[PDB]
């Protein structure tokens, strides 16, 4: 379990920061055929100097979103393969959700890649006090601030509070239930569940506008200004929707907390 956490919850230094950056170069035929996704993992584990375990190799690897391209979905699934003397405890529907939480997690880094791209496209323009540079980068900061704090919520819920559970349980029917309740609460506090689904729903509008903001690199200053203008309305609308669903969730109260300190 404490090996699975390294490579599907990405508890590894510059493994996410090296897998995601190589994967997102593609979106074509690349990152579809089984010789390219077959080799990005062998490069990613070696440049983190934490991996290269048998819990990180000889595991099955595929994808569920093909690159056909906005694109708010990441790709490259990873599965943790188990067999008979591990099957009595570790479930094979539980592992499909291990892949499912890894994919959501890599999609979170997709925004941290896209905003980095548009700040990188802007970098060669300047240092200077030219208006088209400074007033454009002021938009980027806000979206990066949004991404870091929704990430600060997720990096607490799926990784600390649910990881306390089933770690003080390891300090015949029972061990399966202790495993499944742990992953069940991990996907529950991640707000992917149907109960807190409208809270995560507006983040996709957030994310699509971040992609529109990434695509352009300034004559096209006004278009990116307008994309940011739609983004700010959607954030000010999220501020009410998350508050209303604490009368439905004390765990969600940390999220309304996260996105704003004071402020209306």
């Amino acid at each position: 379990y404490e090996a699975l956490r390294h490579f599907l919850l990405m508890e590894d230094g510059e493994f996410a920061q090296s897998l995601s950056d190589l994967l997102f170069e593609k979106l074509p035929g690349e990152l579809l055929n089984p010789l390219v996704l077959n080799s990005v993992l062998s490069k990613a584990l070696q440049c983190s100097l934490h991996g290269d375990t048998p819990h990180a190799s000889n595991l099955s690897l595929a994808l569920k979103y093909l690159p056909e391209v906005p694109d708010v979905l990441s790709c490259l699934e990873l599965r943790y393969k188990v067999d008979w003397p591990l099957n009595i405890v570790i479930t094979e529907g539980c592992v499909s959700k291990y892949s499912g939480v890894f994919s959501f997690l890599l999609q979170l880094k997709l925004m941290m890649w896209a905003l980095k791209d548009v700040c990188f496209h802007l970098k060669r323009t300047a240092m200077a006090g030219s208006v088209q540079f400074r007033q454009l980068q002021l938009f980027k900061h806000e979206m990066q601030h949004f991404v870091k704090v929704i990430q600060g919520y997720i990096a607490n819920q799926i990784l600390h509070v649910t990881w306390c559970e089933f770690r003080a349980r390891l300090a015949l029917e029972e061990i399966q239930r202790a495993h499944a309740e742990y992953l069940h609460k991990a996907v529950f506090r991640g707000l992917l569940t149907e109960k807190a689904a409208p809270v995560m729903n507006v983040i996709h509008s957030i994310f699509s506008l971040v992609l529109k903001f990434r695509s352009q690199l300034h004559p096209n200053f006004a278009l990116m200004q307008q994309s940011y203008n739609t983004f700010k309305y959607y954030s000010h609308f999220l501020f009410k929707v998350v508050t209303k669903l604490v009368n439905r969730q004390p765990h969600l109260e940390d999220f309304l907390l996260r996105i704003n300190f004071n402020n209306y």
């Binding site: 035929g29 579809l32 055929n33 077959n38």
Partner: protein, 53 residues
């Protein structure tokens, strides 16, 4: 010399490319480990010229 030698070597060259591309096609199906194909033509040229996608 430099011309009739070219005449013999080109037909040997074409035959060898046919007999090689067939082998690499029938080796891509065999695995296990991918290091067999990767080491056999380790350059990155003629590693397979009948590429897929």
């Amino acid at each position: 010399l430099v011309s009739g030698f070219e005449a013999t070597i080109n037909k040997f060259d074409k035959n060898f490319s046919a007999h090689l591309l067939d082998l690499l096609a029938r080796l891509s199906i065999y695995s296990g480990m991918a290091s067999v194909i990767s080491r056999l033509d380790f350059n990155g040229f003629y590693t397979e010229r009948l590429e897929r996608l």
